[PDB]
Amino acid sequence: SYNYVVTAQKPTAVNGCVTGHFTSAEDLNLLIAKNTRLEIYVVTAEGLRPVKEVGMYGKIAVMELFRPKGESKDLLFILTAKYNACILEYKQSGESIDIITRAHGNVQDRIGRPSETGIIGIIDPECRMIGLRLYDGLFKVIPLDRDNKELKAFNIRLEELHVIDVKFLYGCQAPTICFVYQDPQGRHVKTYEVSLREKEFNKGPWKQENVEAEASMVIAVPEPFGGAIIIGQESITYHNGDKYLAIAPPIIKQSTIVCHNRVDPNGSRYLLGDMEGRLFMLLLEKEEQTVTLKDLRVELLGETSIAECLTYLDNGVVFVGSRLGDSQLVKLNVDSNEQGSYVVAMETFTNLGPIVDMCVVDLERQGQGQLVTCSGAFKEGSLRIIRNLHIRTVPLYESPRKICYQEVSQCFGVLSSRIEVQDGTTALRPSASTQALSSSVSSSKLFTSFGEEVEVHNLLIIDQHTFEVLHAHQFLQNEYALSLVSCKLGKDPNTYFIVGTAMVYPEEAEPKQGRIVVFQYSDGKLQTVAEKEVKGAVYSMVEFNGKLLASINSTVRLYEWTTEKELRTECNHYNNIMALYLKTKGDFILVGDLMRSVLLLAYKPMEGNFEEIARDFNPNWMSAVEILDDDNFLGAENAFNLFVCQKATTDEERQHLQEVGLFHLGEFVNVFCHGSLVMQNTPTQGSVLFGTVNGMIGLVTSLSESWYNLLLDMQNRLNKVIKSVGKIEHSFWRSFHTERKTEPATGFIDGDLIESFLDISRPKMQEVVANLQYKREATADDLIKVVEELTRIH
Amino acid sequence: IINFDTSLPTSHTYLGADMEEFHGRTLHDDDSCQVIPVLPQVMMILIPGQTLPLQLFHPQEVSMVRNLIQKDRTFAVLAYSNEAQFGTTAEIYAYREEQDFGIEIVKVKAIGRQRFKVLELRTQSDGIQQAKVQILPECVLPSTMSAVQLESLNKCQIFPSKSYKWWQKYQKRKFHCANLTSWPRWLYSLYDAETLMDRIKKQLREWDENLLPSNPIDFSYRVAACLPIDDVLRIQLLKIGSAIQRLRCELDIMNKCTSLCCKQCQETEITTKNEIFSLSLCGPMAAYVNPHGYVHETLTVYKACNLNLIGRPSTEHSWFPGYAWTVAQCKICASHIGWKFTATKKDMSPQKFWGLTRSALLPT
Amino acid sequence: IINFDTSLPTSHTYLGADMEEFHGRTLHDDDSCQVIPVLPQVMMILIPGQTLPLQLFHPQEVSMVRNLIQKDRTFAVLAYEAQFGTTAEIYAYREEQDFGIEIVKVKAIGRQRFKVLELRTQSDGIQQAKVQILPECVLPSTMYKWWQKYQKRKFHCANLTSWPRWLYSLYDAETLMDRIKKQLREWDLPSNPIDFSYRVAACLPIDDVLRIQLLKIGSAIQRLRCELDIMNKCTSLCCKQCQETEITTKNEIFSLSLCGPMAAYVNPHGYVHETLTVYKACNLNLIGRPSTEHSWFPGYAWTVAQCKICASHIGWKFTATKKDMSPQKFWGLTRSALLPT
């Protein structure tokens, strides 16, 4: 197969952010790594002024600024999820700006296990080295002398396998790392010194100590305090040799603290962010003797969006980078409002991620598709309407899970979940499911502890013009609503919302009970028309030639809509695999599970049953599947890959799917769906939009062999002209990647690389197009036409 | 109450002491192809990590094993389904030749290491088969959350371990970032190695009141080897290549099974799954050798029905030291089902159990 | 040509050494009626004079044997319901604790026939048969060159009766014994016709009912005649289960022990097999490995053999452990698994 992937929406989720002096020695700069995009803004009194945006050939996992002696302005160290490490400089001359790669390399180890706490990266305050923690038991040191342009790095054996967090301590003449680790004895802080001359560890300056059982965060306090601050779920403690302080404030006991940022360069104030969206200030009280820390205290500053990271810019202005919601710029006041909150929101940066579901609808009857997506989670949940790129937000204040569109009723059916607290049960905030115009509760006759969280699931009918919540139907207690389709069944002319559910109880592992409920939205209200119990969870459902195909645990079942308006079984097919993914085209049914096992059944209408046309089982986590056409099946695979499988005259060979395409997308695709955002009515056939966890929307189409070969040759020619930031190979970037498995990319064209052909100057175009055969010899003026025609598909 | 030393059966002391022992595991790259001798008379499905004793007397196999001890101490055991498509390589880890009772017999204790698919068999001039096979790898998958995990709470991936509320906290905290995907936490729990292993441990302990390793791969292999299951599902588990899939299939098979009957007359219920108890530390069922070189997959149960005792008790070559055996056979059709083991001393326990040969039973 | 000492199988050296022996004979009266214990498990038509090796392990049987050595050393074996039987007298005995239990291994030489009057049981589980000692109908004289003159002399007076001279030559102990001995020359004895007939009857492969017949036959001449009819009638031996799988013929039968072509041997688990030795056997597949453990014929290693049509155990293949032995190989077929044709 020959496919072409392009990005219609770049990633929006902020996975990291730092602040420093990068662009100049006087301007204050904010650097944001979203997924693969680096964004450099200049901090100004008016807000932010974006100076540059760059694309990396890798997922930024570590990003830190540092200034070694003799460097006028900060350098930027970046590490990617494939372990490409680079040190970069910001070089400017006039209106031209570009990023110099001061050094680069790959710092992977051919053997070893990646940590279960993840990649950790740090820089010594004196810039004497860079320390990484990638595999258990090994601490990788990169000396930072200017002759290390290849980033040669050496490992050191760590006797403590389970390291939680690590930092470089300030005020140390010998590079010292303070880290928190866990053993069957509990959790302990421990400090080492690092010797580059002897290439090994030495005893640290102060002794090992025991800390909270769930202590998980380490802060390196600058001078004159020094020492470190260990933060857990109950207490905040401070260790510096002899000095030892501890507090157990009651305001942090509700949620874990997952990010921090120093506010003052002397270390007197810190900002802390919890999991739920609370923002605290931690204050270090200073006493003069030498200067020693007097006391600690925590003040709840307010509530922000669920913060992935924080950074204090200046003048009481804080940027909150969020993965689950829109990023924020918030002001910090000296006195609280009437609501007792010190935090005021100033600006909001849109974030479509995570996109868990979406649908293509032509709302305006205009021939231009629009994309409605379910974004965010918890209080940040939202609906997004995306069109040709313009985005409109509709906040729900609860998690949206599934979405479908009904034209006969002009409304969207959205599954949603909200978290309540057992106290009966109580809500935490007003949301769409509780602010609906009309509401109902499931009254089916079929079928804990204080303070615990419980999930309440709802079906919301939302108008398509104002996006007001017309109706809200709450399901049974302990009922998880999994699927949602809108379809006509049998001879009946009415359209329905069909919801598949499961009954989940903590004492049971695999659901044994579930329902298929049929709702009709008529004259402003919702009504259950049928309800069929099932011995298993209804994981997915589709409409199949006017019948209903549903996946119940390890079974696939065909239902018919009887004249009495009840669901009558037609046939069952049993599989070794749970049918999480259920796709239909024509009479062909694609069945997938979470372990990459793919199966292809077909329907024999005369025989009225299902038989296995083809099969392809191979252990790997699979996050989505799609049917490109009768023969080709697209899927998203672990490590952020895309695969394309294909359907000898031999029965055994004919029954096996052969993988014909592999690609590394660098994104976690949540949903595939057929559609487009461009005026309907090509060199390309088909259009599949996919949505990912980081908010990036992509398009996959199919090419001809002539076009595929032409664009592949263009790719190989461009990979020799384009200067990749960090000097990462594009062919290395796009190589299909998996745990200890790496293959070259095949069957896919990187549409972003191709579409970058226009940006390069004409001399570079002349360089690229030389000796390329169009059977005429090609010319840049023809490849311009080709690339424009390819770019006009989104 | 049990006080019998559960490490005694695993030693296979009935073969004897002073046996030569070897160390040094010999592994083959997990996707290549190799030529391996096939033991002719071993009609048994061997699963990795499972001991296999043998007493070989044919000159063919004796010469083979004498050669093998001087080379890679590895042979192949084909998982015949009726006709071989998959098998397991066994590595010799104990060895001794004797000239007992007028012939040279070589006794070897071997262990299953790797699985393979059978590409071709070639019957050498010796009447022996050499198998050209391709090694199969163990597909070890990462956590389902490693791809979608949020960095800021990667610090919360290390748990203090010491119970139900603990597993509820475990599900809540490990699969938090399951909110980013399109599936719930409980759905991901059905594919987690730890939860599957814990479920299997509990579900076994429901049968065996007095009731395994810690890594998921060894756990899955041990559970597959020690189940009261027929040959078809045994091969099904053998050809499954992932620890998670193997654990899930083991849990399903474990739930479904209900009873065991006599194979020649299927309506004669010999026992039920609740009598199965583990008298050895290797599990409820294990492979032993009788004095004439026939391997029996004996399953220990507490109570058996419709069995007639036959012959004198004897403590000769006993597979469970400290116990005798009386030949037990079905009372409806008089077909051998196993032996009835009894204590030779007082103060021991159990004073009675039944070792049923797997090939004489049929699940139902 | 045989160099193998044929007196080894008759001594049952597989039951071990240091076995205590009981010299002296005990016999009941010719017509007296006595009550005798019965071995509950052993099914066998024991013929007088025949040796029966036993290994009893049941507590009841061991107890009763222990109380027999105190009394007369006799017990009973029924023909099998049982109308006839034979008493068996112990003459060698031992008790041991081998392999976890108390087992008594003994040897019993059948002595006298009897007809069962009553069978009674005891709470101990063993049975007592109140029986009558069947007597023997010894008869007087009814009236090649040496035997030509013998037939000339002994049957002259036949001219005075209504039967020819030659016909009385078929009902004489000496002529019939000569014919039987001449027929046994190929295979390989007591002179008194009773003992000769008893020894001949116990070494035939015939099925059970024929043996019950011969046991109930009350005269020496009649028993000899029936034995000869059988030796000249039974042509082949076939699998009992199949009834058509031919195992061997009467020409291959040979006497490897001085007791005759057939003899009773006990295996390690106290099972009595009546083994017939033969040079050649057919239609048999060998199972397992050769072994010399508990070998009934010292210096030979046995190998299970079973019918290839039905996989029913027929016997064992004995193969010499050392070279320069004669015969190098032979077969021992258990009579219980055969059927003459």
Ligand SMILES: O=C1CC[C@H](N2Cc3ccc(N4CCC5(CCN(C(=O)c6ccccc6)CC5)C4)cc3C2=O)C(=O)N1
């Ligand atoms: O805890 C335990 C459980 C018991 C187990 N045991 C002991 C044992 C001993 C011996 C044989 N045999 C199997 C083969 C064998 C069969 C019998 N034989 C004939 O000649 C023959 C065949 C048919 C009819 C009459 C006689 C000798 C050869 C002997 C098998 C076994 C066996 O499984 C064990 O070792 N320990």
Ligand SMILES: O=C1CC[C@H](N2Cc3ccc(N4CCC5(CCN(C(=O)c6ccccc6)CC5)C4)cc3C2=O)C(=O)N1
């Ligand atoms: O010259 C000779 C000729 C051979 C003869 N021999 C040796 C011998 C040894 C042993 C048994 N056995 C008969 C009873 C026995 C049967 C096997 N066993 C199971 O457990 C078992 C049963 C069925 C299937 C799997 C295993 C143990 C008990 C052992 C019988 C015999 C016998 O006849 C002899 O002594 N010398």
Ligand SMILES: [Zn+2]
């Ligand atoms: Zn039976």
Ligand SMILES: [Zn+2]
């Ligand atoms: Zn037969």
